[PDB]
Design a protein around this motif. Sequence first.
Motif, PDB file in Angstrom:
ATOM      1  N   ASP B  37     -12.355   8.425   2.866  1.00  0.00           N
ATOM      2  CA  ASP B  37     -11.023   9.004   2.766  1.00  0.00           C
ATOM      3  C   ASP B  37      -9.137   8.295   3.201  1.00  0.00           C
ATOM      4  O   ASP B  37      -9.640   8.477   5.131  1.00  0.00           O
ATOM      5  N   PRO B  44     -16.921  16.799   2.954  1.00  0.00           N
ATOM      6  CA  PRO B  44     -18.512  17.005   2.094  1.00  0.00           C
ATOM      7  C   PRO B  44     -16.973  16.580   0.119  1.00  0.00           C
ATOM      8  O   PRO B  44     -18.112  16.237  -0.578  1.00  0.00           O
ATOM      9  N   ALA B  45     -15.703  17.162   0.736  1.00  0.00           N
ATOM     10  CA  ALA B  45     -15.364  15.925  -0.282  1.00  0.00           C
ATOM     11  C   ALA B  45     -16.054  14.425  -1.128  1.00  0.00           C
ATOM     12  O   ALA B  45     -16.036  13.926  -1.840  1.00  0.00           O
ATOM     13  N   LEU B  47     -18.475  13.044   0.135  1.00  0.00           N
ATOM     14  CA  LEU B  47     -19.649  13.613  -0.286  1.00  0.00           C
ATOM     15  C   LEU B  47     -19.783  13.494  -1.706  1.00  0.00           C
ATOM     16  O   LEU B  47     -20.597  12.696  -3.096  1.00  0.00           O
ATOM     17  N   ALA B  48     -18.897  13.757  -1.781  1.00  0.00           N
ATOM     18  CA  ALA B  48     -18.869  15.013  -3.972  1.00  0.00           C
ATOM     19  C   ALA B  48     -18.342  13.458  -4.872  1.00  0.00           C
ATOM     20  O   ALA B  48     -18.868  13.624  -5.454  1.00  0.00           O
ATOM     21  N   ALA B  49     -17.991  13.094  -4.235  1.00  0.00           N
ATOM     22  CA  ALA B  49     -16.791  11.205  -4.643  1.00  0.00           C
ATOM     23  C   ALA B  49     -17.834  10.512  -4.785  1.00  0.00           C
ATOM     24  O   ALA B  49     -18.004   9.802  -6.018  1.00  0.00           O
TER      25      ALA B  49
END
Lengths: 49, 49
Positions: B37, B44-45, B47-49
Motif C-alpha cells: 500500500d 482490506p483493499a 487483500l482485495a488487490a
Amino acid sequence: ANAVKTAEGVRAKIEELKLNLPEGMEFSIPYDTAPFVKISIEKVIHTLL
Amino acid sequence: DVNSSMANSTEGETMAVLPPAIDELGTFSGFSLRLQDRANLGMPALLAA
C-alpha cells in the motif's frame, strides 16, 4: 558525497512519491545547488572545446 | 510420492519440496514481488488487490 547524485536521488524519490499525493497538495523544490555545479562543469567543458 | 499420497488424507495443506541447491537461492523461483500500500489504501483493499 557528491552533491549531484544526492540531488538526483532526492528528486527521483519526490517524483515517485507525488504519484499518490493527496489532492490539493503539490511538491516544491525552491532551493538547490546541483544545477549550478552542472552548469559550471558544462561551461568549463565548453571553454575547453 | 509424498506429495501425491497425502493430497486429501488430512485437512492440512501438505507439500514436499526438494531443498534448494544453494541455501540462499530460489533455484527455480523466477520472480518475487511485494504488492504494498503506497497510498495508505488500507489492509482490506490490499487483500482485495
